[PDB]
Amino acid sequence: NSTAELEELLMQRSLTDPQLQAAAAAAADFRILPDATVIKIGGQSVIDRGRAAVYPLVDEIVAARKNHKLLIGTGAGTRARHLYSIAAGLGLPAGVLAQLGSSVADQNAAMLGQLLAKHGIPVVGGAGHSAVPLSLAEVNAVVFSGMPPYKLWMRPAAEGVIPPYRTDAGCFLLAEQFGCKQMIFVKDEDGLYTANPKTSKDATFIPRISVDEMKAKGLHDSILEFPVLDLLQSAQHVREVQVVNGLVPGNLTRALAGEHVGTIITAS
Amino acid sequence: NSTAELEELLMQRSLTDPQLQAAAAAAADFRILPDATVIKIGGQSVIDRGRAAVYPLVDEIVAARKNHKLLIGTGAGTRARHLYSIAAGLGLPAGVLAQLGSSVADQNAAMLGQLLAKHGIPVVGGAGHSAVPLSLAEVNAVVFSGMPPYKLWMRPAAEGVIPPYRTDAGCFLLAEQFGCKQMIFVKDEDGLYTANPKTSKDATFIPRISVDEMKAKGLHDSILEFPVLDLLQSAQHVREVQVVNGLVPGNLTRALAGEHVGTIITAS
Amino acid sequence: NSTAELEELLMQRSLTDPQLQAAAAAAADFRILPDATVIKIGGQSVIDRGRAAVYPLVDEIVAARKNHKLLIGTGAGTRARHLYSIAAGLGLPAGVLAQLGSSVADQNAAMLGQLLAKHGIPVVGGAGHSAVPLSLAEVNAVVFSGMPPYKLWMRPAAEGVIPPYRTDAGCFLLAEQFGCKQMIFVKDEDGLYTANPKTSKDATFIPRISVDEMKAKGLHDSILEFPVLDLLQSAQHVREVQVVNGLVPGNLTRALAGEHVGTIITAS
Amino acid sequence: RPIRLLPWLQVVKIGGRVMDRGADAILPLVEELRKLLPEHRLLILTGAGVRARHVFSVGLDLGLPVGSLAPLAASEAGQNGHILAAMLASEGVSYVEHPTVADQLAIHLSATRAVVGSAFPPYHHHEFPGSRIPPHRADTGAFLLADAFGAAGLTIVENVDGIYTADPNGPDRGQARFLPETSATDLAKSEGPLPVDRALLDVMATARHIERVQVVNGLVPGRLTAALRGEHVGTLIRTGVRPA
Amino acid sequence: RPIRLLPWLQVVKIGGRVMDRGADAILPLVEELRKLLPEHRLLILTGAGVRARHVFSVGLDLGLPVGSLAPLAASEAGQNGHILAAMLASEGVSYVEHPTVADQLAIHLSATRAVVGSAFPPYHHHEFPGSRIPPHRADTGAFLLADAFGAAGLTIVENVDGIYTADPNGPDRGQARFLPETSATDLAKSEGPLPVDRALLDVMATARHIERVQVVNGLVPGRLTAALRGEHVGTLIRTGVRPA
Amino acid sequence: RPIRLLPWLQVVKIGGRVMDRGADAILPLVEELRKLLPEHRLLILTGAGVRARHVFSVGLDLGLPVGSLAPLAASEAGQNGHILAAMLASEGVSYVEHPTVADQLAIHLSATRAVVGSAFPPYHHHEFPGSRIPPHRADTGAFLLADAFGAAGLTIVENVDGIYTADPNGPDRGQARFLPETSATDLAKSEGPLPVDRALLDVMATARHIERVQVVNGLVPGRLTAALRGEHVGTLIRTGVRPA
Numbered sequence A, B, C: 001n002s003t004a005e006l007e008e009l010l011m012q013r014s015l016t017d018p019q020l021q022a023a024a025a026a027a028a029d030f031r032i033l034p035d036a037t038v039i040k041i042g043g044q045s046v047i048d049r050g051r052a053a054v055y056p057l058v059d060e061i062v063a064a065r066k067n068h069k070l071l072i073g074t075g076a077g078t079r080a081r082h083l084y085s086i087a088a089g090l091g092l093p094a095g096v097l098a099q100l101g102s103s104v105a106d107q108n109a110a111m112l113g114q115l116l117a118k119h120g121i122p123v124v125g126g127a128g129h130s131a132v133p134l135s136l137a138e139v140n141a142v143v144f145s146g147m148p149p150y151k152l153w154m155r156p157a158a159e160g161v162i163p164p165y166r167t168d169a170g171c172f173l174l175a176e177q178f179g180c181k182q183m184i185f186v187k188d189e190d191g192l193y194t195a196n197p198k199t200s201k202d203a204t205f206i207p208r209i210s211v212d213e214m215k216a217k218g219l220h221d222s223i224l225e226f227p228v229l230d231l232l233q234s235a236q237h238v239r240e241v242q243v244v245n246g247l248v249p250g251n252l253t254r255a256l257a258g259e260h261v262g263t264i265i266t267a268s
Numbered sequence D, E, F: 001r002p003i004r005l006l007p008w009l010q011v012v013k014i015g016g017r018v019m020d021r022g023a024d025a026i027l028p029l030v031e032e033l034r035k036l037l038p039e040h041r042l043l044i045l046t047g048a049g050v051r052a053r054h055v056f057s058v059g060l061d062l063g064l065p066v067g068s069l070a071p072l073a074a075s076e077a078g079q080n081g082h083i084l085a086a087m088l089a090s091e092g093v094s095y096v097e098h099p100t101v102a103d104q105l106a107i108h109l110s111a112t113r114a115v116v117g118s119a120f121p122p123y124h125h126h127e128f129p130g131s132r133i134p135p136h137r138a139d140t141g142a143f144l145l146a147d148a149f150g151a152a153g154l155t156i157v158e159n160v161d162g163i164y165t166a167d168p169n170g171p172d173r174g175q176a177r178f179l180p181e182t183s184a185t186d187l188a189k190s191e192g193p194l195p196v197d198r199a200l201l202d203v204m205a206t207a208r209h210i211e212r213v214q215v216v217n218g219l220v221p222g223r224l225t226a227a228l229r230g231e232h233v234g235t236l237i238r239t240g241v242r243p244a
Ligand SMILES: Nc1ncnc2c1ncn2[C@@H]1O[C@H](COP(=O)(O)OP(=O)(O)OP(=O)(O)O)[C@@H](O)[C@H]1O
Pocket: A041, A042, A043, A044, A045, A046, A074, A075, A076, A077, A078, A166, A167, A168, A187, A188, A189, A191, A192, A193, A194, A195, A196, A197, A198, A219, A221, A222, A223, A224
């Protein structure tokens, strides 16, 4: 390869051209925020539960940002499900529902951000405005709404009008495109089980699994949005994710310290 | 009370329902910026006077932010009065005048902010973007325009089209909703007198007074916008305010140090 | 002079009145960011060259902001020339081309900003949002797009539709209006020569020259946009500029250290 | 008194709880709105409904003050507006943001027959203290706008026939008597729940133009149409602005 | 030369000092504008007037540079625009912001017969140095826009009959002679005050389309109407663009 | 299936490489668009073309990830849109930003016969990983929008007659055979370059409304006009949405 050959292809071929695609794949790989960790705080699993769930995680965030740069994205939760149900019953398309869901994740970011404001932690659009916060020991963290910006250009699912890329996908893609070192999904279960632990009696805990193994076990759409598992196999920078129970005091702190709490899902 | 009963009422009653209103009143009380002080810099009383008034207060702000977190809101002043007079003579409504007045407070915030820029102090929308500035010893203060955001939805006064909620009210409501520890109005008189000291010969200084006492003395609309006194009696967090003379060197500094300069007006 | 006489003229004369103009000229002179240096990173001369040019300058920016407050503006480069050619061939006016060129400088600021994000350095509108960054040792620098905001109100050149005020002018005017101590143009030549060193064999290096001397030598439109030289003679705060070769490792660092690398162009 | 900015405007506030009923309520209302577009120039403003109760539940549990809850509720009214506008998009109807409603409504109603916006006012973190529930909600914002504009009317579209002497869906349901007509001052002197914000009564007291606001049942097709023609099909609220 | 983007457009700049006179001047002008809406497609741009002098007084006392004063003055022109648009709202007229004027004016003039904007250009902190008074003000911004668009005309609506040889309200009032017609180059060679920005003359020298700009007295009803029909009722400024 | 938001809309995507040809291609296309305005309600979306290749060259040399390159390319499509809208400004046509297209398109198409926007979707730094080239580009964004709206059609205006079995301007030019008609699924199973994004084929597979998209040569006057009337003048791509 060479820059000259890449620029030649870039000028003279369609971007669809396999030869161009391959030359572009050999480009150097810059990580924009390599030392940051992206954390998703679940909407339904955490923020909808109010103080008993949110206040301990606020404390952990405040303690953790002493030693860890944090990009904290919020899920949407039950109010988004309500909007999806109204809009779906009207026949509205996935692109319209996508905008509705974003407003609920924004609400959750605003509530979490107000609990963190006195600790110096702002609510921002995304990682592109986190540069100053993440360079300051006094700050070292930001809060953002986790919904992707696709709005009316949301790709629909194969079936139904529920946007397939929601806040798990939004947070994952931010960690991936900013080349972050770690992606932690904070939910309300200890991790992945062989069945939904809420509706199954004897589901077995899975500490570590690959995407292929999840698909083969029927877990494609279990504790993460299924599109996320496919994004993870495509990712250049974040090749595994960790799912932890935010309802367990200190679980996020211990995950940031490298403890294998929860479930590690690997691209391969 | 209980969260479950509150959520029951929230789902099944009108928000107007006294039972719901009462259950909501028992909710816990979070202060968003409990350690910050809101300071209003008068438009007519200070900024319109130019350098002799503004430069000493700039020095005090710079010195004060070493030990105090500051949210500094600007008044509007004579250009807003001019716009109000033009618009009122055209028969325009209070909601239109409200937008006009906001632009003048914005001008004043921009001028003050440019004098503070080299000291690290930014101009922001309001307290919702002050999180990072107020966590930094190098900064620890922000400047904002003091006009409330009501614009065309301004509630009119009982009589006339002058917006009743202007920059005193805007700054007070920000201190109140962010749960700040202190609200200081910086004007051009030492405090409240028994009569307008500019147009009365032998007005007597009042170091401390309640809102009820002010109303009973005919001072309802004297050194603060009268709506502010009613807001103060309704407030959850800021139950007194201090009015000081910004034209006296060091008066703001001494007020921040707990000195009883000026007049303390108490909700009760 | 006196403030009272100035305010008298301001109320009663046209702003065109020579007497008003003269009284306004006697006003005190405040420098908003007196300790900052504005640096323009050339679009065609640096950023269009990719990593070999940009990465060493990124390193220098990171090292330099340890001891220097930096406002770093980006040029536009070849994609703007392409847009200008398309639009000019359509007969579009300079005001339309101005908006097109701004988008290219924005792209360049975004690319540079992403390389600096992990060092804490944000991309901002301009100097009016640099207050917090420039007060922090951890930051002490910002990146901005260098194009002036004139858009459709761009003054056209005497001839042709190429906007005459582009990113050299935009960066210069920012340094001037914020009263910065220094303006450094980072290009791809060691400085000014007696002829275009790319197309002339035996051009001679010029270490120091005034604007009048440049005009007399036929160099009015050489290594800087010609409007910049006229702006420089009108400037109140930045009365000289330095042009340096960003392709020479350490040249920017040495220029910030007071070394006379490159060419110093003086208003007089 | 102030001039009327948009004297030909009709403002219609759609209750959030009407929207909450989904297609069963929204589709008939959309068809009725469709038929109204050639007859009136409409500003259609949506309330918030049940989702704002949920975010109040969370926010109050987190201890957040009333100025934090106000924009959280307003968001829900905006979402309802986006939904309703989408249903009318083929008629040229779009949702417009608050600054657009405030400064550019005249041009937008020149472009198209109706626009949709949020009925909540942008009080934001400058909501008044006192109650932990934001007082200036959808009815109040819609009235403030309609009266500021000097609009020809404000019609409030409810999930009930109008105002009763008790909550007709609540514990005292049995003694709830329908009020065909009332004054804002009479309503303000009563304690007990209403289908309209208490702050609506306060802003009616300082109103400059709107003399009456009708609350009608949007679940009954034709009542909005009749109300916009001044037919008495719900509860008339007299504001205390006097006619000439 | 560049194509004309909006060749059918008429641009009217309303002096800030006309607006400063309040209802006595504004109401007749509003009635005249009303009657013009069916005749012309209008971009109506307002200047700043006396409030910008006050903010210059404060800002200069604070030592602020000319790039700080430019947006402070532009704000006042925007406020005048909001006031004037409010008076025309019932005709479908709204104030539009600078980015909207720059990129979406065609669609807005398709929606409605006229829009109002600020005549100041968005030079902001990139105003040119030299004078401590922002040079690119309302006349200049309005001309830059009108010429960039290739508009059919720019009419400047003043509080005086046109340009005189001396300030007709100033100390040399007595020797002030009315100029029915002048060239920008002749005006630029003269020292002394003008009712138009000196920078207007500079941008006229580089103009591509507008051949003449008439300054007329907006305090005389009918002069704006006559000027928009090319009748000579004030001072004609020839820009030095030549006709075909 | 979802309702059609704007069933009367015609969406036309103009290839960035068509715009790259400058006046020689743009002026005839502008004249053809002019004549189409009274016949159709048009959303005209521009692609990016060669300047996005240049910024990809720089950004990839700098090592930037695909989510960094996506908005950099989208900028170029926006610039093409601003250029094309300027040429149609005298017809009332303006460029509208993405949030405006997303939420207010109905009112803008009520104000005027056509608007121009960027065909790129706002995936921004949330572009999908895998390729170092942003996958969701102009064809893909235009289709996503057209199908989300339930538009009557999407016509893709190319610098070639349609899709061939090989790049008709590339090394295998000689064996390139024209395809008058194809299915998205057939195209997706083939390796090799296409004149349309590969992601277009993916979003066609999940489409709800658009049954066919025609790729036509915008360098041949009249083909866009014919295509908007359903005449077969380029390559028809069947999406796999079935008709009733
Ligand atoms: N096999 C499984 N193992 C673990 N959890 C599972 C499994 N299958 C389903 N789940 C469910 O997935 C849920 C987590 O998804 P949920 O949508 O609640 O998270 P969230 O991130 O809070 O969503 P949002 O943020 O969108 O509100 C768990 O509550 C659990 O009930």
